[PDB]
Amino acid sequence: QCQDVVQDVPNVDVQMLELYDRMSFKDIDGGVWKQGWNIKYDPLKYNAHHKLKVFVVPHSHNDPGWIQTFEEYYQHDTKHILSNALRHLHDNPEMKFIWAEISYFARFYHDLGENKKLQMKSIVKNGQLEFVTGGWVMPDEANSHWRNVLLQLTEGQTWLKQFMNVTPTASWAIDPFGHSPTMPYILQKSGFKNMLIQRTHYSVKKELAQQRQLEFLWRQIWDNKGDTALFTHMMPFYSYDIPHTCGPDPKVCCQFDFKRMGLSCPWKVPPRTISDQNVAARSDLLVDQWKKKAELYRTNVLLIPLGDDFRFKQNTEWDVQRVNYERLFEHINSQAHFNVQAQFGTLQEYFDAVHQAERAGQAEFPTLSGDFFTYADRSDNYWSGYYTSRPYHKRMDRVLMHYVRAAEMLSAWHSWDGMARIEERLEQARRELSLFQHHDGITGTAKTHVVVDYEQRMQEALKACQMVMQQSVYRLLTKPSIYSPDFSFSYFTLDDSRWPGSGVEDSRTTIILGEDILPSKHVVMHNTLPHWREQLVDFYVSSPFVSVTDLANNPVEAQVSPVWSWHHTIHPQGSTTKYRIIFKARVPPMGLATYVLTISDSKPEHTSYASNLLLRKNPSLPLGQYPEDVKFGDPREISLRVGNGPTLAFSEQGLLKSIQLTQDSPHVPVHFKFLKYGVRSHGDRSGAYLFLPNGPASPVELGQPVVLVTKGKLESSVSVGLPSVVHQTIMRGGAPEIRNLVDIGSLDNTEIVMRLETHIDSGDIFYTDLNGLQFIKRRRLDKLPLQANYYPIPSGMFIEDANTRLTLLTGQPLGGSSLASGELEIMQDRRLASDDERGLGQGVLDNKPVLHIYRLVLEKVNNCVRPSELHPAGYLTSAAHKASQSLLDPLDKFIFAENEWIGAQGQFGGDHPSAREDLDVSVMRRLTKSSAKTQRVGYVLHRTNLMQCGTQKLDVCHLLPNVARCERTTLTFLQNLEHLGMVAPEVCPMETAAYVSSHS
Ligand SMILES: [Zn+2]
Structure with a gap:
């Protein structure tokens, strides 16, 4: 009850x-x-x-x-x-x-x-x-x-x-x-x-x-x-x-x-x-x-x-x-x-x-x-500056967050031999991430050399998680009769298209296929979330003539796009030697799915090819074996739709102006715009801590930027090279994904903001989340200066009237506001010559390229059961929640390192229950080393609350076999609150509960 x-x-x-x-x-x-x-x-x-x-x-x-x-x-x-x-x-x-x-x-x-x-x-x-x-x-x-x-x-x-x-x-x-x-x-x-x-x-x-x-x-x-x-x-x-x-x-x-x-x-x-x-x-x-x-x-x-x-x-x-x-x-x-x-x-x-x-x-x-x-x-010294300071490491926090969850979950299914050093690696990873939670870590309020220490520690932690994850996956998908591990060997390398981002570091591996060299390549996707998920995944491949199968050799529809980069006037260049294969991985709850990339002579039956349109004046660009020639044209407006999903209208500088939800419904205006805030010449200077703008933000001169349009059956995007920001809208047939490669460079005493302008009748009301757990009602207060209407945006913000809601979900904590009816805005980076006299003893002059990631969810809520007008909380829709889930806990990608993989199975966790959409297994962690009598595994279960607008029971006590005992615990797993026989009862909306299952 x-x-x-x-x-x-x-x-x-x-x-x-x-x-x-x-x-x-x-x-x-x-x-x-x-x-x-x-x-x-x-x-x-x-x-x-x-x-x-x-x-x-x-x-x-x-x-x-x-x-x-x-x-x-x-x-x-x-x-x-x-x-x-x-x-x-x-x-x-x-x-x-x-x-x-x-x-x-x-x-x-x-x-x-x-x-x-x-x-x-x-x-x-x-x-x-x-x-x-x-x-x-x-x-x-x-x-x-x-x-x-x-x-x-x-x-x-x-x-x-x-x-x-x-x-x-x-x-x-x-x-x-x-x-x-x-x-x-x-x-x-x-x-x-x-x-x-x-x-x-x-x-x-x-x-x-x-x-x-x-x-x-x-x-x-x-x-x-x-x-x-x-x-x-x-x-x-x-x-x-x-x-x-x-x-x-x-x-x-x-x-x-x-x-x-x-x-x-x-x-x-x-x-x-x-x-x-x-x-x-x-x-x-x-x-x-x-x-x-x-x-x-x-x-x-x-x-x-x-x-x-x-x-x-x-x-x-x-x-x-x-x-x-x-x-x-x-x-x-x-x-x-x-x-x-x-x-x-x-x-x-x-x-x-x-x-x-x-x-x-x-x-x-x-x-x-x-x-x-x-x-x-x-x-008027409001501390809204550190909601954005050192945004690279703010982004890195969320990536490491996920890699520790994934590493702990994958390695949790089995007891490991101490020669494997799983426990050593996970302890390092937990501790570097734990250290970064410090109020001078994630805040970006430490000296340059300390931020460097934090970065190197989190780098080491990421490598520790990768080693645990790849060992784990090889064990979960190799026949037991064959499984014979080298605990020092790299069976898979991870592919991550979102950290650091190609454009921050050009470091993704190219799967090199050849009719003779190597014809096929096993890839595996992991799904840390406890429900069936179907998500577009991508890899770099050496030929555009690639076809996707599951292991059972069933064709999978795929799309090939070119690999694009941006350079300095800011213009794209395409690879002549690598291509993106894009296809929909279906992955079980807390599960793994294997697929095969196979080369051919020419355009295979089940792989489409994106068109490319380079909107600029004075155009040309090869793409090697890419079978569809790059088309050219003068800057102009452009519409795009993927699947039955929304239709987006873009300006001639490649910035979103409109979303049509469905084929009947109207073109709702939604303008993206980049602006600047500056520093006060007289009085109090903005720093790592303080946000003290010299008045409202003033628009960024865009000039005429090069707009790249890529149009495909599974995925299309609009990319543009603005000064400081390569802006990108990616469409896959639901809420689009926004990507900003932010390079503030040496624009001293500048804060780059991204604002959304709608006709939504929000008034003085907006919603921002706390620690990615709850959404809290904000009121713009004109009696307070601007920097006091800035709030943390750790995972999302939204505005709404009686009919429309716009939600912006973030892959990184940044500062943001709604400074006027139907607006959202969120700071991307800040470069500050002056100290703000709180003891840091420097400004912020160590900025570096970061790839910020977002989901943009325009929905009608006239049919949603909204809380009382007096309630201080907001709740996401299913679509906005799932969009946050796609930013914070996406599918993991594993490329098999070696030419051949004997024992290969095509799935793990098909038997695993697919829990209601509002439920998450936040933590799976084995609590005992191998030398132990009784194996124990802790689960943190969080259930959010989604706005109702008109699935198997998950019992984590049974996820592992030979369950002898099962306790509801404190969230630290350190105190038993309730012996349970050994079923874990599911948890109320906005509740979090921990359980430890014991094994004989
Ligand atoms: Zn302190």
Whole structure:
């Protein structure tokens, strides 16, 4: 029995879209607390019976890459911090410390002698060193896919459980640049009870501070019942540093950062050593700060973080921080007139205390739905820039996301011999991808050399996945009686037509066929999705005279197109030595399908040939053996249709102007246009973080560009060489695919945007997704500057009136908006000469060619059951969801390396159940190595919610044979929540559930 997530609108105290509408966002000088007010408390609030309980929580913010690489930071800082944490906590039993980034902690702990490891275990066992979140990293929450958020969590917690027998239930996220409700969603399904956040808009901090709504029960925007709710603490002030964590006046709080006496206080009053001669006056000053902070919160329990970036490095910082705070605590606790108990504490300690206060009925907490984007730290400094910064690696994230899913799924079907090194490869791949989830990784907010490290690590991870996938496929499709593997040998190379993209790197392999050299070639397609899929696939072939069969030698209809490249005035050139064979692979759920490419004399029976039309003035171009000559013509408008699918009209610069859905229905206008944003000459400069445009975007001079039109029975495309962008519309008989080869070059202080202009009556309403999990209603707010109407576009955005919807699906996270009724726009790249003064200490001048990929879905929704007009969520159609699925998890292509393949079977997984379209097996992962008694395999099942507009049961517990046991688990697989006999019940719309099947 499942919630309805469409018709029922949840009741919450704070709904962030609603709050945003009714908020003035006035940037008033508030006093010592610049972005709030002068806090008052009644001092008779406190007495011997109602005391203020103060937890002072030492911490050290450790970036796994930012100004330095992971390994640079490890050697310069983090190993010294964790060594000293070990020593000082051992010697000082009341001293406490929290640690978030398990990537750094695993690096450290594995390097320890056995004595140190057991000393480390003792300070974690007695709760002195407490792990918070326990993720590999503290992830980005804007650009990150929920799958990779769960991956990095799963990897840090699995490491903590294996090596420290602990699983944190309190999250600490002090640095991500705005906050997603995806985090509570995953954490609450991973056994968490509490989470803390910091970087929310100063006007939101003020508004919530005023109603003491900084602690709230954060539920998903669709959850009527509140089962998703997680207790959230929002910190009230500008920073997580010591000046902004003691209370409202940083000039006072900075005096209680005892490390600042080659560091100083900006407010020019230094810390002073605490003595019997000044402790009374210092404690008065400090407790006054504490009691002002407590006014903003509903319990008599107060959280005081004590730290900053890479703090607790030197042994004397540990002494000076600990000893001075001891003296203060000694004085304050001994002196009844304060009515304070103050002590070193952990985050869990804080939350426990707050819950005890809730139980005792001391406080009742408000409910909240929504997100905390776009973040502004002051004035108009909105952090929408990093939604696009380093878009190459943003793209690379999504490709590696898929290769890790595919590698884990393919290698999961079987136990492997350790000589195969499957587990080594998958651990490397998970960890490089996990590291990139860091809030200076996927964000593009790291120094040039660190981005290079991230790229080289993800490159290595891609090669590890390829090796696992090709080994796996060879095993799945070779006769058992023949299968005799060389675990070091390349049986298949992978073909990927979308990463990096030919035009970024000309690196795809050409299958070389000859009547004598080599007449045929086995190819295999993998389908990670759990339903039958039929998708056009392509390969490079050395002859255009190629025919496709399955292994059973049934002909398959195919099309051959030329291989086109673009060069510098920007014009295409065709190959005379390679061709694209295009055909429809039918692949089973979570399955494999084999096909054969065979050469012939001449045009084979079942292979068509695309025409080519080169629209320019002053035309010519050979194509070797390509049997249809390249035609020429002057720039002009062009219509194209593939299959019964839509009919697209293109300008004479090869940009979409119109879509006709069906043969009766109208030519709906849909104009693609490239524009620029610039940087402010005066005042605040755009950087890796901040988007600060000098006014609305201004159109790009296109000139007369060369337009290439390729027309074929299975696939046609319109390509054009614009300055900065080779734009391409590909048609295969449904929603078209948009490809931009973006080369911003050295156009300093430029942001290239792509805008869609329709007559859709959207108004001020658009929808953007969070972490590729949910779509959230946005409202353009004219009261906020442009950069504040920019939101993350991690996997899609859409506009709609009562009749029409346009959805743009992305293969990469980029920033975007709807800045006017019937518009969508999405930034492609940004080049920025200036730093934006958030500590990166450079601009963005390392741009490189990236191939961005999209699907464009124009649909009628007048017949779709749309949620209440008051609902803060949107839901994709089946067609838009399947289009996102085609971008993020396409079919994998495998070319057999060797001349002959004995044992070859033509299919795997034909028996596998084809689950409802809204269901996905997000994760298949074998949880046990071979040496193990009982093999265990984890499945994450996510079910989305599709808009209804008028399939076999999938039980993952049975996918593998000899199932002995089957548990519903936390999403990390670390805790059993339910023994099941051993059927997994399917999951509600917008729900995610994990299961582990055991095998005898
Ligand atoms: Zn950070």
